[PDB]
């Protein structure tokens, strides 16, 4: 059991971009916890979102989460030139605690 | 068998907020008593949308009501470890938050809105107003001349609810002399102050007091004035001045104390957002006028507002008939103000009112070992959605006192005695006590209502309270039974 | 207006337990009626010392107070598996057992303070004292002539606490019919009776009931008699007889009983050390004299002790008047006996109280396996710290009778007749039906209080009880309602 | 000549409240015995 990303997409400057991530098998539910993390190259990752809709002190605004039909998606509004990067989602399962995406890379054009 | 006749308003058309005009015909031979009739129309607070996690929305009466995130305090930027966050209807139905249209308010009615919806009353013949008093008149009333017996069918005229008497069944108990099978009586209201959904559409019966509504001998004619004069004006009160809304979502927190034992501690804050509550529209507005068929006692009554500190002496010069026993009641200005959540539950308080807030939680404790067994492993402390809030009205007064021209008259006597002795000992069986210690009475005769003879007669009013400062006021109101001559 | 006048005590400093001394100064025309008012001070009771766990200690009342060791029983020498003993407060927070000063005991008041502070009050004109009561004839005229109107009144001044009416808030419900959104009403106390760590002081009002204290036109002249000669001599209760302790301190036992399920049964021993309640100190004592400006009902009252069995014949040769209604109760002597836990809670009770107690535990069944699941895996039983007791009173007679000089009178009728009927159907509204069904009372007039003019008058007590024996004694107090002349 | 109807008539009307639990006892009805429970926590709220 592992989850799946999708291995990249492009957004324009200003726009909007929705990254998914979703289990191999079965749903993601909302006690999946997903968690999006942003990592800069050459940075260490930063925790972009917990528990799915919420945004520790420090994540800008744009960021949005949220759960559509059987898999989680981050939403970008505006996305602005700081945010490429690669976007990791993990999920909480309960024997294997948490399980990490490969790995998203976002182009900003 | 005297009839009631159905007189329509005069104005027309009557709505929240704006004056209501009542008229006099001529059908009977002497008028006695009146009541005027509305039918409240239903209210139901407009769809809202419930919030995302993480967001803080300006609420009502300067609170910031907050939906924080998982892990964090009631105040969002304060880490909480373990306490996670859901959106909960007060009933503890889920709501899935971020949903558009599923978040509604419960909506009250303030406490006696019979005696809010008539604020001010004036009775004119061409002009010059004989008789005029307001909604803390009718309040002071209630509170003491309304019996006792007849408390449960004022409390349904104004429309206030019951308490409904239920029973629980058979219990185990115990007897303990120095066993037996006992029946638990509680109590619930469904009435109009029951925060609804839909709160459905009430009837309104406010009596109209005047002075010749007293006794049917000191009714006045129908044909020594003419009926055309005689008009009745009455201030109908604001949609926000009656209905308040109830938090029709709270915010669940679940807060998981790591440790031994280990603590489910959930708790619930109410997420109060303001909406609209839909225009109340007043139907079948009648007056029912008791036209029968075939010297004078006037209650004079002012309003005063007051913010000095220690020593209060206000004059009056309004009074110059002989006076009577007289109520009078000091009801504090946030009690009537629009920045009070409790605005409508206590505006019929003529004390400092305060809540006590009961959270009983349902503790449970339970282990898993079944080795150590000593300490539990887990614990719980579920509380209530809704808080039990009692109101207690603590005293506004100290020492009461009333000055007359010349001589002391009324010296700093202490509110107990003119709240609670006063009423216990002069009065009668008319006269109640009021559960309300702000109001009190002061006497003038031996028999107040014993028999219909002046047994005494006639000004001041000062009290060395501890409540009234720079940003805290008060408003004295009072109601004397006062003599007048009609000819 | 006529005014109030603060007459000072004759003896001054007043103590609890001690004589007080009221003189009648002379600045009015007539005095019709009089209120005696004292401001007890702070109530608290001394810090304590928290017990060491296995140490079993004198308590009050001939009980044993033990914090037992764990596994063991409430009794020291019993074993009982699982069982583990914490010391917390009443309101659940620990107590850290062996810590010096962190153990204070709760105090009550005792019901109806007002009552009870003036235990005999007597009026003397150069000695021949014209009237004596006690407080069991308060008491009684409490139960009986004070109207339902005026209780929460007489409750105020007397200084016992109101129930505070509070809600909780929209609950679910059902309807049933061969859903809706309801409240739920619950009452609470904040006065005096309530077990407090710290009592404020208080105001009590005791009014001071004569033969001249009820009509305006039968108010004694204070011109025709000096005034130096009428004194009031009036015997306060003692501290102890007023103040009365809660248990500061709960022995807390968890108990693990093994198995499927795996019961975790917690409870709670009251610990009872009596500390040293601080003085009383009377403040601000005065003596409220109505000294307006400008064929009796003296009631004779006798107090007497019983204690035969299944024929108690008393006669009396004080009653020489004609007497009107009467009201007479039979108070068991354990009422206020020193030895009664409860004696402050059921002094002015006329019946044999004993104590129904609500023990409501939160149940929670939980299960662990997710595979069994019929059976529950682990249980819970978390009681109340304290427990609800109710006061139940008993009737103290089977049959009343009283037999005149030469004819059968009253004769062996149910103390249910004459504690329930004769108080529904004479006296009027006056006259209200005491809850308390050991209080009854025996009419001799058409018309008690309907007119004033009297309609019939006119000796032996006698009851078949079954509560009476050699340990177990009775108390009666009488109030006739006498008629005497006055030159 | 009356009904069990004319009596509770009666009673919901003429009887007063000071007489209510008079009438209850003498008819056989049950009357609420009120008790306490003890100290409690609660809270004051000022605004």
């Known amino acids: 059991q592992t989850v799946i990303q999708e291995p990249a997409m492009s957004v324009s400057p200003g726009g909007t971009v929705t990254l998914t991530c979703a289990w191999s098998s079965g749903s993601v539910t909302t006690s999946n916890y997903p968690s999006w993390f942003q990592q800069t190259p050459g940075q260490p990752p930063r925790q972009l979102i917990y528990n799915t809709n919420s945004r520790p002190t420090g994540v800008p605004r744009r960021f949005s989460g949220k759960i559509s039909g059987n898999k989680a998606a981050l939403t970008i509004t505006g996305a602005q030139a700081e945010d490429e990067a690669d976007y990791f989602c993990g999920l909480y399962k309960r024997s294997a605690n948490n399980i990490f995406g490969g790995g998203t890379h976002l182009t900003v054009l | ?487």
């Not at chain 2, 910031?64 to 009631?74: A, H, I, K, M, S």
């Not at chain 2, 009324?410 to 009065?427: A, L």
């Open chain 2, 1 to 487: 068998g005297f009839e009631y006749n159905k007189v329509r308003p005069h104005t027309g058309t009557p709505t929240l907020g704006n004056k209501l005009t009542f008229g006099i015909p001529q059908y009977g031979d002497f008028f006695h008593d009146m009541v005027g009739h509305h039918i409240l129309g239903a209210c139901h607070s407009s769809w809202q949308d419930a919030p995302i996690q993480g967001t803080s929305q300006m609420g009502a009466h300067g609170q910031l009501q907050t939906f924080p995130r998982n892990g964090y305090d009631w105040d969002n930027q304060t880490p909480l470890e373990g306490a996670v966050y859901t959106l909960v209807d007060p009933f503890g139905r889920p709501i899935v938050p971020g949903t558009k249209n599923a978040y509604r308010n419960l909506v009250y009615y303030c406490e006696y809105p019979g005696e809010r919806l008539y604020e001010n009353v004036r009775f004119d013949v061409n002009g010059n107003s004989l008789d005029e008093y307001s909604s803390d008149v009718t309040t002071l009333v209630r509170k003491f001349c309304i019996p006792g017996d007849k408390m449960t069918g004022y409390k349904h005229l104004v429309g206030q609810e019951v308490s409904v008497e239920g029973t629980s069944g058979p219990l185990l108990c115990n007897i303990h002399d120095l066993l037996d099978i006992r029946r638990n009586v509680h109590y619930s209201c469904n009435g109009p102050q029951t925060p609804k959904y839909y709160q459905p559409p009430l009837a309104l019966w406010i009596k109209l007091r005047f002075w010749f509504n007293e006794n049917v001998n000191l009714a006045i004619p129908s044909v020594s004035i003419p009926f055309g004069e005689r008009f009745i004006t009455i201030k109908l009160a604001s949609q926000k001045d009656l209905v308040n809304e109830f938090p029709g979502l709270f915010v669940r927190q679940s807060r998981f104390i790591a440790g031994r034992p280990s603590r489910r501690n959930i708790r619930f804050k109410p997420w109060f957002i303001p909406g609209v509550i839909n225009e109340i529209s007043l139907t079948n507005n009648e007056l029912y006028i008791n036209n029968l068929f075939v010297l004078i006692r006037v209650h004079k009554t002012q309003v005063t507002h007051t913010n000095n500190n220690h020593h209060d002496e206000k004059l009056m010069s309004a009074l110059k008939w002989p006076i009577e026993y007289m109520f009078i009641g000091l009801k504090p200005t946030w009690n009537i103000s629009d920045q009070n959540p409790h605005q409508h539950r206590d505006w019929h308080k003529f004390g400092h009112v305060v809540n006590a807030i009961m959270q009983p939680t349902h503790h449970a404790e339970i282990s898993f070992q079944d080795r150590d067994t000593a300490l539990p492993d887990a614990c719980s402390s579920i509380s209530d959605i809704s808080p039990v809030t009692y109101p207690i009205t603590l005293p506004i007064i100290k020492n009461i006192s009333v000055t007359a021209h010349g001589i002391n008259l009324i010296d700093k006597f202490p509110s107990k005695f003119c709240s609670s002795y006063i009423p216990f000992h002069y009065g009668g069986n008319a006269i109640k006590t009021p559960d309300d210690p702000g109001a009190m009475m002061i006497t003038f005769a031996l028999k107040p209502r014993e028999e219909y003879q002046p047994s005494g007669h006639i000004f001041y009013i000062s009290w060395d309270t501890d409540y009234v400062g720079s940003i805290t006021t008060a408003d004295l109101v009072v109601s004397a039974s006062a003599i007048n001559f009609l000819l």
